[PDB]
Amino acid sequence: VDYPRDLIGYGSNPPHPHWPGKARIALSFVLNYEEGGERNILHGDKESEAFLSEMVSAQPLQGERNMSMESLYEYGSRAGVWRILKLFKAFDIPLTIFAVAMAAQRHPDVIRAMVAAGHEICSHGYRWIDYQYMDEAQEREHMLEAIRILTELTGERPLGWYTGRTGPNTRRLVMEEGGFLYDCDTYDDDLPYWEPNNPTGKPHLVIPYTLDTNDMRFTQVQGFNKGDDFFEYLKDAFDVLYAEGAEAPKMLSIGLHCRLIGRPARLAALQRFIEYAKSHEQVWFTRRVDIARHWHATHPYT
Amino acid sequence: VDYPRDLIGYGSNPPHPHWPGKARIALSFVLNYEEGGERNILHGDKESEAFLSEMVSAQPLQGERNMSMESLYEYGSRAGVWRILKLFKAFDIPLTIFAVAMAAQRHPDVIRAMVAAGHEICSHGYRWIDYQYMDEAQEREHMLEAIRILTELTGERPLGWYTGRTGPNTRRLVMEEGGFLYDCDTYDDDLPYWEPNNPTGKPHLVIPYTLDTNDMRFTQVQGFNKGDDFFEYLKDAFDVLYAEGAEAPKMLSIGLHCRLIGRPARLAALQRFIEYAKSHEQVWFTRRVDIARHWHATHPYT
Amino acid sequence: VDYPRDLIGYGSNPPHPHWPGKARIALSFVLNYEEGGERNILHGDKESEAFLSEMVSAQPLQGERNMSMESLYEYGSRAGVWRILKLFKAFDIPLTIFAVAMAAQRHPDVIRAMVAAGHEICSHGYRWIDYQYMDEAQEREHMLEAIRILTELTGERPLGWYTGRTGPNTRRLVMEEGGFLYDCDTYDDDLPYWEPNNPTGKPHLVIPYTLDTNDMRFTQVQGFNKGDDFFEYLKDAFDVLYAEGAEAPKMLSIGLHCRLIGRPARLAALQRFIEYAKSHEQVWFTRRVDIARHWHATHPYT
Amino acid sequence: VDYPRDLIGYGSNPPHPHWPGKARIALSFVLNYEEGGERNILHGDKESEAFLSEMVSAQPLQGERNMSMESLYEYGSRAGVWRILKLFKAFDIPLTIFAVAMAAQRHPDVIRAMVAAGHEICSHGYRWIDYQYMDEAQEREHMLEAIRILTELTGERPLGWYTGRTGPNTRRLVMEEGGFLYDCDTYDDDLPYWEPNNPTGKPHLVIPYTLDTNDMRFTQVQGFNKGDDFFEYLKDAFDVLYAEGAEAPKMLSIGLHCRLIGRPARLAALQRFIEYAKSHEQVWFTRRVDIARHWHATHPYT
Fold first, then answer.
1. Of all helices (H) and strands (E), which one includes residue D260?
2. In this complex, do A7 and D74 lie within 8 Å of one another by their Cβ atoms?
3. Coil, helix or strand for D98?
């Protein structure tokens, strides 16, 4: 039996990350930019989008446009993004942008704005779709196209990758490409680790992401009712990890979407959490590529 | 590629609305009146209603009456409406009524009461149904009939429109009719804007509405558990926008339904929010047609 | 057009109920007793039960027993019922029991206990099933059997009726039987009213019930997370109605289930609400038949 | 009519458990260890897992691996388990581990760690799957294999059993095997009881478990939004039972999963509850086998 999953990881002995500034916790705020790259018959897809909107019981419509769904996504690119970017500038916290290439193509000025502000542009795929059933040839073709578009748009190729709705081949293809420093398509640890299955042989860093400390839950069946639920949820995660960080620091990812936390009713809670985190000493507010370069310098692959 | 959606909007430069009384925020409370116009085999539909009731997992019943569903809707027209109207009169806040024409026909006295109180009657369609799949000929026919009924009932034609569950043709037809000042069938901004696609050429104002600061969420899968969740949600939206309004005022819509916020358990939270909003200076409590006339005088279409 | 629904009711002029003791509000606590009468292949049904249990995503199993579901229902009859009955005895608040006849047959001692404590036994149908699709002949036969069983078990025939999941014929059949003082199969008002469609001609009182101030929501998709959500929800309903009751008193129903509020985690909130209600003067804690007899003496049918 | 269910139980006269140290309540914290034994085509199943993860609307994928689902489960075995075990060691509270045999085989070191810490290893089945439709021959074969694996791994055979998603034969087979002291596959009481249907004739103890004071609800449609909801829920259950325990002590089960409460955002609430429980005198923090041995000594089967 050759069991491909690693259920053990670091076991009872996770490594000390030695974060900069003696930090007891590292925080990675991530802003997804997906608006303009989601399912739409305009984009050539077979159906309309149904995932992550105020229309909490929406289903895909075959061969149809869902106008309300489209409008909800437009809030993200029209209004939410600028509000969120302002918030992070006000507290001088850097972002990593999981940017969908097709979305970025449709609003190049906001992407340019993000680059000028010093945020990291990470690849979030060519399209914002589910890759579960896509043939390997086509998924690999999407991947290379995502890199092309983001390189042209930002000026440098992306060094991180996150699909989200992966298939069985996604991560293998990402690591096979050779050019990424890291990917985030796992939810399996509180610390980065070197991928144990990289035949390429080059070191590939895994920086796990999150589906729980993530504003996606505002629109899911099991899901925050009000902003303060998200604040309390983040505060609890922070508290437990910051406590552990007296001896064994870890990291925490906070996932955000323009069309979701960009609504004023939800932004208030994110600000309260940022204020809470800022009120503590020894917190490393950082970007994901910075975590990756740090890991390389601190725990090189052996 | 001719991409029909506007993902950019005002970009990073939204206009100053110069609301009356130097207001830092404009609030539009909206009361939907749908009861008596929803799906029912009595109305000629193929199935019973399932959307927005205490029967949170209800499905449409083909060729059947759902008696419990009917009774829940009746609470709205029998009891909830009068309670809500009293609340708004007590704080002297005007309403815009998204009135469904068939519903209004069935309770002309409550509509007359709303008109005498000075509330704006806006069209919410001929029937409260999903227009996704309706042929353009029939949808346009519905539209003209809605205008006919509301004109006869109120004494003047409606100047605003909101379908809700739109199809691909709805907004185009509304703007094509020529007689509306505005529509609200978008969720894409925090400010009104002139429709960029009106071949008619006449200026048509878009006043975006909301599916999040909306009591509909009390009955949806992702949804407020208690009144205070809705209060906190509205309070957060208000706070963020009122703060921004020190330099760049915006608006906020609060959507209400007779059968939902009309229940005493839920009305309490709406009153607490009204009290909260009233405790602030520089708040414009207004109707949607008043926003439209203001926009015309302040930022005429160029 | 002969529209069978009454969307208007009392309109803007609800009657003053003149509750005993000058009460500003009447409270009707209702305990459902359904355990042992729900769907089960043992009972002859085609499938297992799926409605109102901790197994919130359960579906009916065709031709199968669902052992976990059965066990959850058994908690109600084994443990929850006695805990709830004790609570009400401790505060000397009377109950109306919506008792399912088949359930009562299976635990005659608890029914006898309820009768000795002075609680009203109201009929909740022969079986706890959905009557939407049942033929009129069979539904009427069920009804008469429910009356037979409850009469034998309690010593007197039931004078109230509540099916819950009604079909198009349920209420008509109940009123046709002639022997009931009232039914509760509506959710359409805050006050009792005389049925406008009783060809029998005898006065039949409607005492509306509730799906919102009801512990059923602890197990539904849109649903209280913790006890305090239910407490706050009830407190808000009470507050609004008690306020209105300075000039126009109304009633409020609180619906309970043995297998649900009988759990200690949920009972605490009900006790807090009972304490809250008891802390106010001018509250009529009563049974539904008592409301009906009061209405007869105070607002006889004309 | 031979009705197989016991709807009555102890009726109004539950026995006094005489817990050690004069305890007014007995608490059984249970940690499920399922990770590595859930549905997976790697394990020979027909589909991927969908139950109890952050992917709250996940469905099984036929003949496919769901990589995100796998990664979420891996968090449990990689990171959550060690965090949870540390918490319980810090407060010196013993655990009962419902261990799935296939899961234990895949991480023998964590199981050995649990045994050395003095936790009880209880059988949670050979595989973490739904047994509703499994033939009796195959279910019995699974059972014996679970016992084999756990005996080899722990050094002694398991004396308790809990499947969870039982079929109509599960409990009968468990009791037929002869070697268990107890099982927990019911949710029907607040106290242990002797199984009334054990033809074996040997006494078999039932120690009811829970689907409500259970962290599974963090991922279910009806489900805690934030940690504090779970804390309040547990606190309420504790309070009501501790109050009753002045005269009639009972027990309370607290169900936990590595991949769920192991997340820092959720662990905080469990710690707050442990602190709350510890702040009271007369609380028996115990293991399930210890409850069983106590029952044998205190209320032997007659």
1. helix D258-261
2. yes
3. strand
Residues of C in contact with D164 (CB under 8 A): 68
Check which CATH number belongs to the domain holding A246 and give it: 3.20.20.370
Rounded to whole angstroms, what are the CA distances from A63 to A47, A57, C129?
5, 19, 39
Number of neighbouring beta carbons within 10 Å of residue C89: 14
> Which residue from C164, C184, C276, C295 is spatially nearest to C230, judged by alpha carbons?
C276
Cβ–Cβ under 8 Å, residues C206 and C183 = yes
Give bridge partners of residue B219 from the DSSP assignment.
none
Question: How does strand D25-33 pair with strand D96-99?
Answer: parallel
Backbone angles phi, psi at A283, to 5 degrees: -125, 125
CA B130, CA B69: separation in Å to the nearest integer? 17
Q: Which residue of B has its CA nearest to A217?
A: B222
Tracing tokens 């690849």 back to the chain, one arrives at: A123
How many C-beta atoms surround the C-beta of residue D73 within 10 A? Answer: 29
Write down the residue that tokens 């008690």 correspond to: C242
Q: For chain D, state the CA radius of gyration.
A: 19
Experimental method reported for this structure = X-ray
Identify all chain C residues contacting D174, using CB atoms and an 8 Å cutoff: none
CA dihedral (B127, B130, B133, B136) positive or negative? positive
Closest to B218 in 3D by CA, of A212, A226, A6, C279 = A226
Q: Which of B42, B71, B270, B275 to mutate to test the interface with C (most CBs of C within 10 A)?
A: B71
- H, E, C per residue of chain B: CCCCCCCCCCCCCCCCCCCHHHCCEEEEEEEEECCCCCCCHHHCCCECCCCCCCCCCCCCCECCCCHHHHHHHHHHHHHHHHHHHHHHHHCCCCCEEEECHHHHHHCHHHHHHHHHCCCEEEECCCCCCCCCCCCHHHHHHHHHHHHHHHHHHHCCCCCEECCCCCCCCHHHHHHHHCCCCEECCCCCCCCCEECCCCCCCCCCEECCCCCCCEHHHHHCCCCCCCHHHHHHHHHHHHHHHHHHCCCCCEEEEEEEEHHHHCCHHHHHHHHHHHHHHHCCCCEEECCHHHHHHHHHHHCCCC
- Asked if the Cβ–Cβ distance from D225 to C225 is below 8 Å, we say yes
Q: Say which residues have a Cβ less than 8 Å from residue A74's Cβ, sequence separation at least 6.
A: A35, B5, B6, B7, B9, B186, B188
DSSP letter (8 states) at residue A141: H
Which element (helix H / strand E) includes D71?
helix D67-75
Q: How far apart are CA D226 and CA A212, in angstroms?
A: 10
C-alpha A242/C-alpha A26 separation (Å) is 9
User: What's the number of domains chain A is made of?
Assistant: 1
Q: What is the largest CA-CA distance in chain B?
A: 55
Q: How far, in Å, CA of B3 to CA of C275, rounded?
A: 61
Relative to beta strand C193-194, strand C205-206 is antiparallel
Q: Which residues of D have a CB under 8 Å from any CB of A?
A: 35-36, 42, 54-57, 61, 64-68, 70-72, 74-75, 77-79, 82-83, 106-107, 109, 113, 218-221, 223, 225-228, 263-269
Parent domain of B215: 1-302
- Provide, for chain A, the percentages of residues in helix, strand and coil under a 3-state DSSP scheme, each rounded to the nearest 5: 40, 15, 45
